[PDB]
C-alpha cells in the first residue's frame, strides 16, 4: 500500500534558537481514486496537536503524496525525545506508524583544523582543507568565509564513522588573488560547541 | 446477514500500558492437548498408557483452551461424549472456563476459499459468514466460553492483504465475541455467560501484528516460551504496551513435549526456581498482569532428558499449582 | 521478490572482479557463471570498455599530502590529510602506508565537485623521521598506481 517516510530537522535549525526547527512526515503511494491522510504527532508517546499539514501534491501517475511538519522545540530534540508520526487512511489495515530521534550518545566537542595547499598544488591553475573530527551524532554545518563575506565555492563530504565511534568529516574550499595577500575562516556548528558554534582561520 | 463494513480502525485499544486496576482478577490459563486425553480414540505407538484426563487438571484453573488436532488421531466422538457427560459438568461446578482453540492458518484458509482478498470494500458478509461457521462448530457447538484466535504466522505481519483479511475476520468474530460482542452487553471477564475472544501469538508485538486485533480481545497470550527470566518479561510486555493494556497481557510457557524438537527451558527443573515460575511472578511495572498460561499441561514437569522425550508420564501438575500460586497470590 | 558492479579495487589489478519466500539465472546484447534470515566473473579490460532484468559510468576519465596543524599537536591526535581530487569515474582505491600498510586510515566517500569531476579526502614514527605515503589507484593513473609521501 502507501509508504511512511520520517525525515529530521536540518542541524542549522536545530543549533540557532532564531531558526525554526520542523519534523517531516511523508505518506507516499495513495492511489486508488480514494484518497484523505489523516496524522497523529506523539512526543515521547503523548499527542500534541500542533502540527501544520496542507501541502497536498497530486505528483501525477496515478498517486497522492501528502506530508505533515511538526514544529519541533530545540531542546526537545536536543534532550534525544522521540518524536512518533502515525498515518490513517482507509486503504491501510492498521495505520502506519513512524519514530524518529536524535542519535543516542553521550555527545563529543568537534575538533577544527585548517589545512593549507600542499606546494605540489600551486603549479596546477588551490584548496583550502577544513578537518572536522572527533564529534558525536552526524549532525553538523561547516561552511566558509573570508572577512565577514561567505565563500561559495566549497564542497564538504558527508560524515564518516571513525575507528572510536565518533565522527569526522573533510571540506575543501577552492580558489590565485586574496589568498595570494594572506588573507579565510571555516565555520562549525555542533551541539557541543560553546554557543554551538566556532572558527578556525587560515591564512598564508 | 448485516451488510455493515468491517472497519480497519484501532491500532490500540481504548486503554494501553500498564494498568494498576482492572475489573477481573488475574485468571491462570491453561492449554490442554486433547490428542493426549483418555476419552480421544487415537497404529499409534501409544495406542493405550493414556493416563491423564481433562478433570485431572488443578480446579483452581481459571480457564482451559482446548488444542485440537484432528490429524492425530482416528476418532474424536468418544472424547466428546466423555467431555459433555463427564468433563465439562465437573470443570462448570469448578468454575473453570473451556475455551476452543483454532489455527488462524484455517481462518486465511476459509477467507481465501470464499474468494476475499485484502481490500478496504469487500462484499460485507462472507467474514460474517466464515465467523458465524466458525462460532456454530467451535463454541456454540458444545456450549464452551470463547474462541482463541492462534496466529504465529509470520506472512501475516508481511503482506497487506492478509492483515486485511485478518482484520476483518477479527472484527466479524468480535461481532460474537469479545468486550465489541453485543451479546457482552453489561457483562465483564469472569461474569458467568460471557464469552471471550483471545489471541495467542509470538511475543514480538510486530510480527504478533497485535495492532490489528488490539481493540477486540479480552486477553493477549505471548509464546514466551525461551524467557524465564523478568527483564526479558519487561521488555516483551513494553514492546506490547503501547498496543495493548497490561490486564489484557498474558506471559506463557510451554513444558516439554515427547518428539519436540523446538526445546524450551523455561519449565525443567525444580519448581521454586524455573524461570516458568519467573514468568508467573513476573508483573507489568507498576501494573496488573491478564494472567499466566501454560502449553501443555498433561506434560507439566516433564522435560527433553532421558525417557522424557520418547515416554507418556501421568503429571502431578505442580507447575500449574505453583503458577496459579503466583498469578492470583494465593495458597493452595 | 534484480544490478550492482564489482569490487573498484578487483578492476584495477589484472585480482578478480565479479557481478552479480518458502516459491522458493539468464548477458554481457555468456555461460559461465554459478542464506536464511533468523556471481558472474568479468574481464578486466571488459568492464573497463564499458561493456525482473547497466555498466560502468560513461564518460572521460592530483593527489596531495597535508601535514597536521600546529593546533592538532596538543593532546594525542594528529591526522594526515590526504587529498585526491580531478578524477572522474567515483570508482577508486586509497590506502595508506609507511613498505608496510597502516590501517587507522579512513576515507570520505566521492563528492562530485562543481566542475562535474570527483575528490575524496583519507585521513590517517612521525616525529622521528618517519615517511608515510598515500596510495591511490585509479584508471587514469600510470601503471593504475600512485603515491603521495608526507613526512615532518
Given at each position: 500500500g ?14 540557532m ?9 511523508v ?10 491522510v ?5 512526543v ?23 506530508v505533515?511538519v511538526?514544529?519541533?522545540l ?12 502515525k498515518?490513517?487512511?482507509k486503504?491501510l ?10 542519535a ?6 568537534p ?5 593549507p ?25 561547516v ?13 564538504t ?40 558554534y ?5 591564512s598564508? | ?6 472497519a ?16 477481573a ?64 459438568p ?19 484458509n476459509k477467507?481465501k476459499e470464499?474468494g476475499?482478498y ?16 466458525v ?18 504466522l ?13 482484520r ?15 451479546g ?30 488490539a ?19 519487561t521488555?516483551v ?15 506463557g ?11 524450551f ?16 511472578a513476573?508483573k507489568?511495572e507498576?501494573?496488573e ?17 532421558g ?6 508420564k501421568?503429571?502431578?501438575f505442580?507447575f ?7 498469578t ?5
Open positions: 502507501p509508504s511512511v517516510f520520517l525525515f529530521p530537522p536540518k542541524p542549522k535549525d536545530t543549533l534558537i532564531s531558526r525554526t526547527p520542523e519534523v517531516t512526515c505518506v507516499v503511494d495513495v492511489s486508488h481514486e480514494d484518497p484523505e489523516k496524522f497523529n504527532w506523539y515521547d508517546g503523548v499527542e500534541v496537536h500542533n502540527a501544520k499539514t496542507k501541502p497536498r501534491e497530486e505528483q501525477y501517475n496515478s498517486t497522492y503524496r501528502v505533515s511538526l514544529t519541533v530545540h531542546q526537545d530534540w536536543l534532550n534525544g525525545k522521540e518524536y512518533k508520526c498515518v490513517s487512511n486503504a489495515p492498521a495505520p502506519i506508524e513512524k519514530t524518529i530521534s536524535k543516542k550518545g553521550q555527545p563529543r566537542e575538533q577544527v583544523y585548517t589545512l595547499p600542499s606546494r605540489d598544488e600551486l603549479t596546477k591553475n588551490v584548496s583550502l582543507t577544513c578537518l572536522v573530527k572527533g564529534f558525536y551524532p552526524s549532525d553538523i554545518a561552511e566558509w568565509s573570508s572577512n565577514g563575506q561567505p565563500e561559495n565555492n566549497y564542497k563530504t558527508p560524515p564518516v564513522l571513525d575507528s572510536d565511534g565518533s565522527f569526522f568529516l573533510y571540506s575543501k574550499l577552492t580558489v590565485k588573488s586574496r589568498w595570494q595577500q594572506g588573507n579565510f575562516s571555516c565555520s562549525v556548528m555542533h551541539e557541543a560547541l560553546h554557543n554551538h566556532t572558527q578556525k582561520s587560515l598564508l | 446477514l448485516s451488510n455493515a463494513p468491517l480497519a480502525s484501532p491500532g490500540q485499544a481504548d486503554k494501553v500500558g500498564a494498568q494498576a486496576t482492572c475489573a482478577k488475574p485468571i491462570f490459563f491453561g492449554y490442554y492437548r486433547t490428542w493426549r486425553d483418555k476419552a480421544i480414540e487415537l497404529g499409534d505407538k501409544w495406542k493405550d498408557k493414556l493416563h491423564t484426563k481433562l478433570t485431572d487438571i488443578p480446579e483452581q484453573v481459571d480457564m482451559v483452551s482446548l488444542f485440537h488436532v484432528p490429524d492425530n488421531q482416528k476418532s474424536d466422538q468418544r472424547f466428546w461424549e466423555t467431555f459433555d457427560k463427564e468433563y465439562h465437573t470443570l462448570k461446578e469448578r468454575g473453570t472456563k473451556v475455551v476452543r482453540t483454532i489455527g488462524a492458518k484455517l481462518l486465511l477467507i470464499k476475499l485484502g481490500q478496504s470494500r469487500e462484499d460485507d458478509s462472507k467474514y460474517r459468514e466464515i465467523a458465524h461457521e462460532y456454530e462448530e467451535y463454541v456454540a457447538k458444545h456450549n464452551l466460553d470463547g474462541l482463541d484466535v492462534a496466529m504465529a509470520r506472512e501475516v505481519e508481511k503482506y497487506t492483504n492478509l492483515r486485511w483479511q485478518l476483518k475476520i477479527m472484527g466479524a468474530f468480535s461481532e460474537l465475541m469479545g468486550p465489541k460482542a453485543p457482552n452487553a453489561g457483562k465483564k471477564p469472569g461474569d458467568d455467560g460471557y464469552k471471550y475472544l483471545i489471541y495467542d501469538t509470538f511475543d514480538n508485538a510486530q510480527l504478533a501484528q497485535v495492532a490489528l486485533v481493540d477486540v480481545v479480552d486477553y493477549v497470550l505471548a509464546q514466551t516460551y525461551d524467557k524465564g527470566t523478568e527483564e526479558s518479561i521488555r510486555w513494553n514492546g506490547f504496551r503501547d498496543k495493548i493494556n497490561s490486564c489484557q497481557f498474558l506471559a510457557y510451554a513444558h516439554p513435549e515427547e518428539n519436540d524438537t523446538n526445546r527451558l523455561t519449565a525443567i527443573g525444580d519448581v521454586d526456581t524455573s524461570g516458568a515460575m519467573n514468568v508467573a513476573w507489568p507498576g501494573g498482569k491478564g494472567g499466566t498460561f501454560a502449553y501443555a499441561l498433561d506434560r507439566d514437569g516433564r522435560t527433553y532428558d525417557d522424557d522425550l520418547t515416554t507418556l501421568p503429571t502431578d505442580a500449574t499449582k505453583r503458577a496459579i500460586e503466583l492470583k497470590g494465593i495458597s493452595l
